[PDB]
Amino acid sequence: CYHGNGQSYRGTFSTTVTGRTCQSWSSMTPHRHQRTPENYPNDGLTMNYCRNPDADTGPWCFTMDPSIRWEYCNLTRC
């Protein structure tokens, strides 16, 4: 679990809500994006971990599902 909007979340959980696997923020595969550790160095954008680099309402991620752009992660607001 995370606190607030999980802005501070820097945990190693990477499974979407639907049991789908989180894509690595570095990788442009399958979802091509700009939320990179490279564009946002102080965000926690490590590997495929779940983060909220964007003032979302909980920690989310880009999905390894070519069909699913992104989703929240299977976490709970501590």
PDB file of N, CA, C and O in Angstrom:
ATOM      1  N   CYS A   1       0.841  -1.207   0.000  1.00  0.00           N
ATOM      2  CA  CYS A   1       0.000   0.000   0.000  1.00  0.00           C
ATOM      3  C   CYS A   1       0.882   1.265   0.000  1.00  0.00           C
ATOM      4  O   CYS A   1       2.047   1.224   0.401  1.00  0.00           O
ATOM      5  N   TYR A   2       0.214   2.326  -0.410  1.00  0.00           N
ATOM      6  CA  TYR A   2       0.684   3.690  -0.572  1.00  0.00           C
ATOM      7  C   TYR A   2      -0.103   4.702   0.261  1.00  0.00           C
ATOM      8  O   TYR A   2      -1.233   4.450   0.724  1.00  0.00           O
ATOM      9  N   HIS A   3       0.485   5.892   0.445  1.00  0.00           N
ATOM     10  CA  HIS A   3      -0.195   6.991   1.176  1.00  0.00           C
ATOM     11  C   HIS A   3      -0.580   8.085   0.170  1.00  0.00           C
ATOM     12  O   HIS A   3      -0.131   8.053  -0.981  1.00  0.00           O
ATOM     13  N   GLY A   4      -1.340   9.047   0.636  1.00  0.00           N
ATOM     14  CA  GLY A   4      -1.839  10.159  -0.198  1.00  0.00           C
ATOM     15  C   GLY A   4      -2.246   9.581  -1.555  1.00  0.00           C
ATOM     16  O   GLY A   4      -2.837   8.486  -1.567  1.00  0.00           O
ATOM     17  N   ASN A   5      -1.834  10.264  -2.612  1.00  0.00           N
ATOM     18  CA  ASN A   5      -2.035   9.856  -4.013  1.00  0.00           C
ATOM     19  C   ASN A   5      -0.869   9.001  -4.522  1.00  0.00           C
ATOM     20  O   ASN A   5      -0.588   8.837  -5.729  1.00  0.00           O
ATOM     21  N   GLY A   6      -0.155   8.446  -3.561  1.00  0.00           N
ATOM     22  CA  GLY A   6       0.979   7.567  -3.837  1.00  0.00           C
ATOM     23  C   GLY A   6       1.982   8.276  -4.730  1.00  0.00           C
ATOM     24  O   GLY A   6       2.560   7.645  -5.641  1.00  0.00           O
ATOM     25  N   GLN A   7       2.218   9.549  -4.368  1.00  0.00           N
ATOM     26  CA  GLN A   7       3.211  10.341  -5.147  1.00  0.00           C
ATOM     27  C   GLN A   7       4.611   9.896  -4.745  1.00  0.00           C
ATOM     28  O   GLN A   7       5.459   9.743  -5.639  1.00  0.00           O
ATOM     29  N   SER A   8       4.686   9.518  -3.493  1.00  0.00           N
ATOM     30  CA  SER A   8       5.863   9.065  -2.757  1.00  0.00           C
ATOM     31  C   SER A   8       6.177   7.581  -2.924  1.00  0.00           C
ATOM     32  O   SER A   8       7.256   7.084  -2.502  1.00  0.00           O
ATOM     33  N   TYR A   9       5.198   6.908  -3.514  1.00  0.00           N
ATOM     34  CA  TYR A   9       5.379   5.478  -3.746  1.00  0.00           C
ATOM     35  C   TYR A   9       6.633   5.223  -4.605  1.00  0.00           C
ATOM     36  O   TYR A   9       6.685   5.596  -5.787  1.00  0.00           O
ATOM     37  N   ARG A  10       7.492   4.461  -3.974  1.00  0.00           N
ATOM     38  CA  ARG A  10       8.773   4.028  -4.494  1.00  0.00           C
ATOM     39  C   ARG A  10       9.039   2.581  -4.121  1.00  0.00           C
ATOM     40  O   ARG A  10      10.150   2.143  -3.811  1.00  0.00           O
ATOM     41  N   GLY A  11       7.957   1.796  -4.201  1.00  0.00           N
ATOM     42  CA  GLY A  11       7.894   0.368  -3.940  1.00  0.00           C
ATOM     43  C   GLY A  11       8.155  -0.431  -5.217  1.00  0.00           C
ATOM     44  O   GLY A  11       8.105   0.092  -6.334  1.00  0.00           O
ATOM     45  N   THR A  12       8.383  -1.725  -5.022  1.00  0.00           N
ATOM     46  CA  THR A  12       8.684  -2.663  -6.099  1.00  0.00           C
ATOM     47  C   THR A  12       7.484  -3.499  -6.562  1.00  0.00           C
ATOM     48  O   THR A  12       7.669  -4.630  -7.083  1.00  0.00           O
ATOM     49  N   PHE A  13       6.299  -2.963  -6.429  1.00  0.00           N
ATOM     50  CA  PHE A  13       5.106  -3.716  -6.962  1.00  0.00           C
ATOM     51  C   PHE A  13       4.842  -3.168  -8.375  1.00  0.00           C
ATOM     52  O   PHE A  13       4.797  -1.959  -8.620  1.00  0.00           O
ATOM     53  N   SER A  14       4.656  -4.105  -9.296  1.00  0.00           N
ATOM     54  CA  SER A  14       4.401  -3.879 -10.695  1.00  0.00           C
ATOM     55  C   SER A  14       3.283  -4.733 -11.308  1.00  0.00           C
ATOM     56  O   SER A  14       3.534  -5.117 -12.472  1.00  0.00           O
ATOM     57  N   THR A  15       2.182  -4.978 -10.640  1.00  0.00           N
ATOM     58  CA  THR A  15       1.053  -5.719 -11.295  1.00  0.00           C
ATOM     59  C   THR A  15      -0.176  -4.824 -11.355  1.00  0.00           C
ATOM     60  O   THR A  15      -0.479  -4.119 -10.394  1.00  0.00           O
ATOM     61  N   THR A  16      -0.747  -4.749 -12.554  1.00  0.00           N
ATOM     62  CA  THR A  16      -1.895  -3.844 -12.734  1.00  0.00           C
ATOM     63  C   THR A  16      -3.032  -4.412 -11.883  1.00  0.00           C
ATOM     64  O   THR A  16      -2.826  -5.403 -11.163  1.00  0.00           O
ATOM     65  N   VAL A  17      -4.122  -3.671 -11.934  1.00  0.00           N
ATOM     66  CA  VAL A  17      -5.332  -4.045 -11.155  1.00  0.00           C
ATOM     67  C   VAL A  17      -5.929  -5.359 -11.657  1.00  0.00           C
ATOM     68  O   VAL A  17      -6.132  -6.337 -10.858  1.00  0.00           O
ATOM     69  N   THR A  18      -6.027  -5.498 -12.948  1.00  0.00           N
ATOM     70  CA  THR A  18      -6.490  -6.643 -13.732  1.00  0.00           C
ATOM     71  C   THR A  18      -5.499  -7.785 -13.843  1.00  0.00           C
ATOM     72  O   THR A  18      -5.592  -8.670 -14.713  1.00  0.00           O
ATOM     73  N   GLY A  19      -4.496  -7.782 -12.958  1.00  0.00           N
ATOM     74  CA  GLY A  19      -3.427  -8.803 -12.958  1.00  0.00           C
ATOM     75  C   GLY A  19      -2.455  -8.696 -14.117  1.00  0.00           C
ATOM     76  O   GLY A  19      -1.624  -9.618 -14.326  1.00  0.00           O
ATOM     77  N   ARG A  20      -2.529  -7.599 -14.870  1.00  0.00           N
ATOM     78  CA  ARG A  20      -1.601  -7.376 -16.018  1.00  0.00           C
ATOM     79  C   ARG A  20      -0.238  -6.861 -15.537  1.00  0.00           C
ATOM     80  O   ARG A  20      -0.057  -6.437 -14.370  1.00  0.00           O
ATOM     81  N   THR A  21       0.814  -7.117 -16.322  1.00  0.00           N
ATOM     82  CA  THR A  21       2.174  -6.691 -15.960  1.00  0.00           C
ATOM     83  C   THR A  21       2.539  -5.305 -16.508  1.00  0.00           C
ATOM     84  O   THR A  21       2.150  -4.949 -17.611  1.00  0.00           O
ATOM     85  N   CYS A  22       3.148  -4.548 -15.592  1.00  0.00           N
ATOM     86  CA  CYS A  22       3.681  -3.205 -15.820  1.00  0.00           C
ATOM     87  C   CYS A  22       4.917  -3.192 -16.751  1.00  0.00           C
ATOM     88  O   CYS A  22       5.899  -3.947 -16.599  1.00  0.00           O
ATOM     89  N   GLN A  23       4.795  -2.256 -17.680  1.00  0.00           N
ATOM     90  CA  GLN A  23       5.877  -2.022 -18.677  1.00  0.00           C
ATOM     91  C   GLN A  23       6.922  -1.120 -17.987  1.00  0.00           C
ATOM     92  O   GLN A  23       6.638  -0.345 -17.045  1.00  0.00           O
ATOM     93  N   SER A  24       8.160  -1.375 -18.441  1.00  0.00           N
ATOM     94  CA  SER A  24       9.329  -0.596 -17.949  1.00  0.00           C
ATOM     95  C   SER A  24       9.263   0.786 -18.567  1.00  0.00           C
ATOM     96  O   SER A  24       8.989   0.945 -19.765  1.00  0.00           O
ATOM     97  N   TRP A  25       9.330   1.774 -17.688  1.00  0.00           N
ATOM     98  CA  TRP A  25       9.192   3.208 -18.080  1.00  0.00           C
ATOM     99  C   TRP A  25      10.163   3.714 -19.151  1.00  0.00           C
ATOM    100  O   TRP A  25       9.956   4.773 -19.825  1.00  0.00           O
ATOM    101  N   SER A  26      11.261   3.035 -19.297  1.00  0.00           N
ATOM    102  CA  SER A  26      12.377   3.180 -20.186  1.00  0.00           C
ATOM    103  C   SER A  26      12.029   2.699 -21.581  1.00  0.00           C
ATOM    104  O   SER A  26      12.421   3.215 -22.627  1.00  0.00           O
ATOM    105  N   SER A  27      11.363   1.569 -21.614  1.00  0.00           N
ATOM    106  CA  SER A  27      10.885   0.877 -22.808  1.00  0.00           C
ATOM    107  C   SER A  27       9.702   1.671 -23.386  1.00  0.00           C
ATOM    108  O   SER A  27       8.828   2.219 -22.693  1.00  0.00           O
ATOM    109  N   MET A  28       9.747   1.629 -24.704  1.00  0.00           N
ATOM    110  CA  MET A  28       8.778   2.247 -25.603  1.00  0.00           C
ATOM    111  C   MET A  28       7.824   1.172 -26.154  1.00  0.00           C
ATOM    112  O   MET A  28       7.003   1.482 -27.047  1.00  0.00           O
ATOM    113  N   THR A  29       7.995  -0.044 -25.661  1.00  0.00           N
ATOM    114  CA  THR A  29       7.303  -1.267 -25.989  1.00  0.00           C
ATOM    115  C   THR A  29       6.527  -1.878 -24.804  1.00  0.00           C
ATOM    116  O   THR A  29       7.091  -2.260 -23.749  1.00  0.00           O
ATOM    117  N   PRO A  30       5.247  -2.124 -24.996  1.00  0.00           N
ATOM    118  CA  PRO A  30       4.466  -1.846 -26.187  1.00  0.00           C
ATOM    119  C   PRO A  30       3.971  -0.419 -26.296  1.00  0.00           C
ATOM    120  O   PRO A  30       3.636   0.089 -27.402  1.00  0.00           O
ATOM    121  N   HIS A  31       3.837   0.254 -25.165  1.00  0.00           N
ATOM    122  CA  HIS A  31       3.316   1.645 -25.235  1.00  0.00           C
ATOM    123  C   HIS A  31       4.438   2.656 -25.304  1.00  0.00           C
ATOM    124  O   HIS A  31       5.372   2.729 -24.486  1.00  0.00           O
ATOM    125  N   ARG A  32       4.379   3.345 -26.454  1.00  0.00           N
ATOM    126  CA  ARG A  32       5.362   4.408 -26.745  1.00  0.00           C
ATOM    127  C   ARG A  32       4.896   5.605 -25.919  1.00  0.00           C
ATOM    128  O   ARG A  32       3.703   5.948 -25.988  1.00  0.00           O
ATOM    129  N   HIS A  33       5.790   6.113 -25.092  1.00  0.00           N
ATOM    130  CA  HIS A  33       5.523   7.234 -24.191  1.00  0.00           C
ATOM    131  C   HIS A  33       6.741   8.122 -23.870  1.00  0.00           C
ATOM    132  O   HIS A  33       7.905   7.734 -24.073  1.00  0.00           O
ATOM    133  N   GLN A  34       6.428   9.219 -23.193  1.00  0.00           N
ATOM    134  CA  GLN A  34       7.369  10.254 -22.747  1.00  0.00           C
ATOM    135  C   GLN A  34       7.571  10.373 -21.256  1.00  0.00           C
ATOM    136  O   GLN A  34       8.455  11.103 -20.750  1.00  0.00           O
ATOM    137  N   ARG A  35       6.820   9.598 -20.485  1.00  0.00           N
ATOM    138  CA  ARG A  35       7.009   9.541 -19.035  1.00  0.00           C
ATOM    139  C   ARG A  35       8.212   8.614 -18.818  1.00  0.00           C
ATOM    140  O   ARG A  35       7.985   7.487 -18.335  1.00  0.00           O
ATOM    141  N   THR A  36       9.403   9.143 -19.150  1.00  0.00           N
ATOM    142  CA  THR A  36      10.623   8.280 -19.000  1.00  0.00           C
ATOM    143  C   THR A  36      11.456   8.736 -17.818  1.00  0.00           C
ATOM    144  O   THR A  36      11.256   9.856 -17.320  1.00  0.00           O
ATOM    145  N   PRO A  37      12.244   7.823 -17.280  1.00  0.00           N
ATOM    146  CA  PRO A  37      13.173   8.165 -16.174  1.00  0.00           C
ATOM    147  C   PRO A  37      14.099   9.274 -16.707  1.00  0.00           C
ATOM    148  O   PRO A  37      14.520  10.122 -15.942  1.00  0.00           O
ATOM    149  N   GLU A  38      14.296   9.240 -18.015  1.00  0.00           N
ATOM    150  CA  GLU A  38      15.074  10.159 -18.808  1.00  0.00           C
ATOM    151  C   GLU A  38      14.466  11.558 -18.950  1.00  0.00           C
ATOM    152  O   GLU A  38      15.266  12.510 -19.155  1.00  0.00           O
ATOM    153  N   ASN A  39      13.173  11.689 -18.914  1.00  0.00           N
ATOM    154  CA  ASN A  39      12.478  12.975 -19.022  1.00  0.00           C
ATOM    155  C   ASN A  39      12.158  13.511 -17.622  1.00  0.00           C
ATOM    156  O   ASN A  39      11.948  14.724 -17.479  1.00  0.00           O
ATOM    157  N   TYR A  40      11.950  12.616 -16.682  1.00  0.00           N
ATOM    158  CA  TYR A  40      11.562  12.862 -15.294  1.00  0.00           C
ATOM    159  C   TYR A  40      12.434  12.069 -14.302  1.00  0.00           C
ATOM    160  O   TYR A  40      12.009  11.060 -13.735  1.00  0.00           O
ATOM    161  N   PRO A  41      13.652  12.611 -14.073  1.00  0.00           N
ATOM    162  CA  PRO A  41      14.696  12.011 -13.267  1.00  0.00           C
ATOM    163  C   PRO A  41      14.433  11.945 -11.791  1.00  0.00           C
ATOM    164  O   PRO A  41      15.027  11.075 -11.109  1.00  0.00           O
ATOM    165  N   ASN A  42      13.531  12.775 -11.304  1.00  0.00           N
ATOM    166  CA  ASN A  42      13.272  12.703  -9.821  1.00  0.00           C
ATOM    167  C   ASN A  42      11.942  12.029  -9.552  1.00  0.00           C
ATOM    168  O   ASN A  42      11.313  12.296  -8.506  1.00  0.00           O
ATOM    169  N   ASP A  43      11.480  11.110 -10.424  1.00  0.00           N
ATOM    170  CA  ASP A  43      10.168  10.444 -10.210  1.00  0.00           C
ATOM    171  C   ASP A  43      10.144   9.014  -9.724  1.00  0.00           C
ATOM    172  O   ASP A  43       9.018   8.525  -9.366  1.00  0.00           O
ATOM    173  N   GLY A  44      11.229   8.249  -9.696  1.00  0.00           N
ATOM    174  CA  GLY A  44      11.155   6.836  -9.225  1.00  0.00           C
ATOM    175  C   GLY A  44      10.934   5.811 -10.327  1.00  0.00           C
ATOM    176  O   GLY A  44      10.784   4.593 -10.069  1.00  0.00           O
ATOM    177  N   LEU A  45      10.919   6.280 -11.539  1.00  0.00           N
ATOM    178  CA  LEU A  45      10.735   5.647 -12.816  1.00  0.00           C
ATOM    179  C   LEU A  45      11.725   4.524 -13.040  1.00  0.00           C
ATOM    180  O   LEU A  45      12.304   4.284 -14.116  1.00  0.00           O
ATOM    181  N   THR A  46      11.944   3.749 -11.995  1.00  0.00           N
ATOM    182  CA  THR A  46      12.847   2.580 -12.021  1.00  0.00           C
ATOM    183  C   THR A  46      12.140   1.335 -12.560  1.00  0.00           C
ATOM    184  O   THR A  46      11.029   1.050 -12.104  1.00  0.00           O
ATOM    185  N   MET A  47      12.789   0.615 -13.418  1.00  0.00           N
ATOM    186  CA  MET A  47      12.300  -0.611 -14.046  1.00  0.00           C
ATOM    187  C   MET A  47      10.827  -0.453 -14.446  1.00  0.00           C
ATOM    188  O   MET A  47      10.486   0.520 -15.163  1.00  0.00           O
ATOM    189  N   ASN A  48       9.981  -1.400 -14.058  1.00  0.00           N
ATOM    190  CA  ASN A  48       8.555  -1.460 -14.348  1.00  0.00           C
ATOM    191  C   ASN A  48       7.729  -1.139 -13.107  1.00  0.00           C
ATOM    192  O   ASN A  48       6.473  -1.270 -13.146  1.00  0.00           O
ATOM    193  N   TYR A  49       8.404  -0.820 -12.019  1.00  0.00           N
ATOM    194  CA  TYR A  49       7.708  -0.515 -10.764  1.00  0.00           C
ATOM    195  C   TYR A  49       6.536   0.434 -10.969  1.00  0.00           C
ATOM    196  O   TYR A  49       6.552   1.378 -11.804  1.00  0.00           O
ATOM    197  N   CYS A  50       5.591   0.337 -10.066  1.00  0.00           N
ATOM    198  CA  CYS A  50       4.395   1.187  -9.982  1.00  0.00           C
ATOM    199  C   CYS A  50       4.792   2.544  -9.364  1.00  0.00           C
ATOM    200  O   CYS A  50       5.326   2.535  -8.235  1.00  0.00           O
ATOM    201  N   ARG A  51       4.411   3.627  -9.998  1.00  0.00           N
ATOM    202  CA  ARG A  51       4.630   5.015  -9.628  1.00  0.00           C
ATOM    203  C   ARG A  51       3.437   5.875 -10.096  1.00  0.00           C
ATOM    204  O   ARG A  51       2.512   5.429 -10.767  1.00  0.00           O
ATOM    205  N   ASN A  52       3.401   7.062  -9.573  1.00  0.00           N
ATOM    206  CA  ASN A  52       2.423   8.117  -9.783  1.00  0.00           C
ATOM    207  C   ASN A  52       3.172   9.446 -10.061  1.00  0.00           C
ATOM    208  O   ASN A  52       3.117  10.361  -9.219  1.00  0.00           O
ATOM    209  N   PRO A  53       3.947   9.441 -11.129  1.00  0.00           N
ATOM    210  CA  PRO A  53       4.755  10.578 -11.533  1.00  0.00           C
ATOM    211  C   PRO A  53       3.869  11.737 -11.921  1.00  0.00           C
ATOM    212  O   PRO A  53       4.400  12.796 -12.267  1.00  0.00           O
ATOM    213  N   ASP A  54       2.549  11.519 -11.893  1.00  0.00           N
ATOM    214  CA  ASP A  54       1.644  12.538 -12.440  1.00  0.00           C
ATOM    215  C   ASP A  54       0.513  13.068 -11.609  1.00  0.00           C
ATOM    216  O   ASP A  54      -0.387  13.777 -12.159  1.00  0.00           O
ATOM    217  N   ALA A  55       0.596  13.018 -10.294  1.00  0.00           N
ATOM    218  CA  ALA A  55      -0.533  13.571  -9.525  1.00  0.00           C
ATOM    219  C   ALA A  55      -1.824  12.796  -9.859  1.00  0.00           C
ATOM    220  O   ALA A  55      -2.925  13.401  -9.777  1.00  0.00           O
ATOM    221  N   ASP A  56      -1.664  11.507 -10.183  1.00  0.00           N
ATOM    222  CA  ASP A  56      -2.866  10.682 -10.414  1.00  0.00           C
ATOM    223  C   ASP A  56      -3.388  10.423  -8.994  1.00  0.00           C
ATOM    224  O   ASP A  56      -2.768  11.088  -8.125  1.00  0.00           O
ATOM    225  N   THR A  57      -4.365   9.531  -8.795  1.00  0.00           N
ATOM    226  CA  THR A  57      -4.939   9.279  -7.468  1.00  0.00           C
ATOM    227  C   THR A  57      -4.418   8.054  -6.722  1.00  0.00           C
ATOM    228  O   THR A  57      -4.731   7.813  -5.511  1.00  0.00           O
ATOM    229  N   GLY A  58      -3.553   7.309  -7.348  1.00  0.00           N
ATOM    230  CA  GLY A  58      -2.828   6.140  -6.827  1.00  0.00           C
ATOM    231  C   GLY A  58      -1.722   5.788  -7.848  1.00  0.00           C
ATOM    232  O   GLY A  58      -1.764   6.262  -9.015  1.00  0.00           O
ATOM    233  N   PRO A  59      -0.804   4.947  -7.453  1.00  0.00           N
ATOM    234  CA  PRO A  59       0.281   4.460  -8.313  1.00  0.00           C
ATOM    235  C   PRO A  59      -0.213   3.634  -9.502  1.00  0.00           C
ATOM    236  O   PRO A  59      -0.821   2.545  -9.254  1.00  0.00           O
ATOM    237  N   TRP A  60       0.161   3.974 -10.724  1.00  0.00           N
ATOM    238  CA  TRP A  60      -0.299   3.289 -11.965  1.00  0.00           C
ATOM    239  C   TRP A  60       0.858   2.828 -12.828  1.00  0.00           C
ATOM    240  O   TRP A  60       1.993   2.694 -12.353  1.00  0.00           O
ATOM    241  N   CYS A  61       0.707   2.595 -14.111  1.00  0.00           N
ATOM    242  CA  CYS A  61       1.805   2.154 -14.997  1.00  0.00           C
ATOM    243  C   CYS A  61       1.276   1.888 -16.410  1.00  0.00           C
ATOM    244  O   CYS A  61       0.042   1.707 -16.556  1.00  0.00           O
ATOM    245  N   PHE A  62       2.185   1.867 -17.372  1.00  0.00           N
ATOM    246  CA  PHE A  62       1.897   1.440 -18.754  1.00  0.00           C
ATOM    247  C   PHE A  62       1.949  -0.102 -18.693  1.00  0.00           C
ATOM    248  O   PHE A  62       2.733  -0.679 -17.901  1.00  0.00           O
ATOM    249  N   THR A  63       1.016  -0.732 -19.375  1.00  0.00           N
ATOM    250  CA  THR A  63       0.799  -2.175 -19.387  1.00  0.00           C
ATOM    251  C   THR A  63       1.573  -2.896 -20.472  1.00  0.00           C
ATOM    252  O   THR A  63       1.544  -2.372 -21.563  1.00  0.00           O
ATOM    253  N   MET A  64       2.043  -4.094 -20.177  1.00  0.00           N
ATOM    254  CA  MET A  64       2.687  -4.921 -21.226  1.00  0.00           C
ATOM    255  C   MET A  64       1.628  -5.470 -22.186  1.00  0.00           C
ATOM    256  O   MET A  64       1.966  -6.135 -23.189  1.00  0.00           O
ATOM    257  N   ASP A  65       0.381  -5.054 -21.949  1.00  0.00           N
ATOM    258  CA  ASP A  65      -0.726  -5.382 -22.868  1.00  0.00           C
ATOM    259  C   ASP A  65      -0.829  -4.268 -23.937  1.00  0.00           C
ATOM    260  O   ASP A  65      -1.252  -3.123 -23.749  1.00  0.00           O
ATOM    261  N   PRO A  66      -0.527  -4.685 -25.150  1.00  0.00           N
ATOM    262  CA  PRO A  66      -0.553  -3.809 -26.322  1.00  0.00           C
ATOM    263  C   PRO A  66      -1.911  -3.146 -26.521  1.00  0.00           C
ATOM    264  O   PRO A  66      -2.092  -2.078 -27.143  1.00  0.00           O
ATOM    265  N   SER A  67      -2.886  -3.839 -25.976  1.00  0.00           N
ATOM    266  CA  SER A  67      -4.291  -3.467 -25.938  1.00  0.00           C
ATOM    267  C   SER A  67      -4.592  -2.509 -24.797  1.00  0.00           C
ATOM    268  O   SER A  67      -5.592  -1.770 -24.871  1.00  0.00           O
ATOM    269  N   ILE A  68      -3.841  -2.602 -23.669  1.00  0.00           N
ATOM    270  CA  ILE A  68      -4.109  -1.708 -22.533  1.00  0.00           C
ATOM    271  C   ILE A  68      -2.936  -0.729 -22.321  1.00  0.00           C
ATOM    272  O   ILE A  68      -1.947  -1.168 -21.736  1.00  0.00           O
ATOM    273  N   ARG A  69      -3.182   0.496 -22.658  1.00  0.00           N
ATOM    274  CA  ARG A  69      -2.245   1.639 -22.576  1.00  0.00           C
ATOM    275  C   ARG A  69      -1.683   1.714 -21.169  1.00  0.00           C
ATOM    276  O   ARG A  69      -0.476   1.397 -21.065  1.00  0.00           O
ATOM    277  N   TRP A  70      -2.515   1.916 -20.179  1.00  0.00           N
ATOM    278  CA  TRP A  70      -2.053   1.884 -18.769  1.00  0.00           C
ATOM    279  C   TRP A  70      -3.197   1.507 -17.840  1.00  0.00           C
ATOM    280  O   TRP A  70      -4.350   1.350 -18.301  1.00  0.00           O
ATOM    281  N   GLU A  71      -2.959   1.315 -16.572  1.00  0.00           N
ATOM    282  CA  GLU A  71      -3.898   1.001 -15.509  1.00  0.00           C
ATOM    283  C   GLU A  71      -3.291   1.226 -14.109  1.00  0.00           C
ATOM    284  O   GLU A  71      -2.034   1.301 -13.940  1.00  0.00           O
ATOM    285  N   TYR A  72      -4.176   1.388 -13.117  1.00  0.00           N
ATOM    286  CA  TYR A  72      -3.644   1.451 -11.738  1.00  0.00           C
ATOM    287  C   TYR A  72      -3.092   0.072 -11.366  1.00  0.00           C
ATOM    288  O   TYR A  72      -3.292  -0.920 -12.070  1.00  0.00           O
ATOM    289  N   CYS A  73      -2.332   0.092 -10.280  1.00  0.00           N
ATOM    290  CA  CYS A  73      -1.689  -1.112  -9.753  1.00  0.00           C
ATOM    291  C   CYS A  73      -2.544  -1.587  -8.565  1.00  0.00           C
ATOM    292  O   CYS A  73      -3.161  -0.722  -7.943  1.00  0.00           O
ATOM    293  N   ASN A  74      -2.449  -2.865  -8.329  1.00  0.00           N
ATOM    294  CA  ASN A  74      -3.121  -3.631  -7.298  1.00  0.00           C
ATOM    295  C   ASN A  74      -2.605  -3.354  -5.879  1.00  0.00           C
ATOM    296  O   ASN A  74      -2.125  -4.262  -5.175  1.00  0.00           O
ATOM    297  N   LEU A  75      -2.801  -2.111  -5.489  1.00  0.00           N
ATOM    298  CA  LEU A  75      -2.415  -1.533  -4.216  1.00  0.00           C
ATOM    299  C   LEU A  75      -3.568  -0.870  -3.445  1.00  0.00           C
ATOM    300  O   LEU A  75      -4.677  -0.596  -3.912  1.00  0.00           O
ATOM    301  N   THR A  76      -3.210  -0.574  -2.180  1.00  0.00           N
ATOM    302  CA  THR A  76      -4.194   0.010  -1.264  1.00  0.00           C
ATOM    303  C   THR A  76      -3.604   1.181  -0.484  1.00  0.00           C
ATOM    304  O   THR A  76      -2.567   1.119   0.176  1.00  0.00           O
ATOM    305  N   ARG A  77      -4.436   2.221  -0.507  1.00  0.00           N
ATOM    306  CA  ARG A  77      -4.176   3.454   0.195  1.00  0.00           C
ATOM    307  C   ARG A  77      -4.051   3.183   1.698  1.00  0.00           C
ATOM    308  O   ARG A  77      -5.019   3.326   2.453  1.00  0.00           O
ATOM    309  N   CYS A  78      -2.841   2.840   2.065  1.00  0.00           N
ATOM    310  CA  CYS A  78      -2.383   2.719   3.449  1.00  0.00           C
ATOM    311  C   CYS A  78      -3.119   3.806   4.283  1.00  0.00           C
ATOM    312  O   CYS A  78      -4.035   3.437   5.016  1.00  0.00           O
TER     313      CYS A  78
END
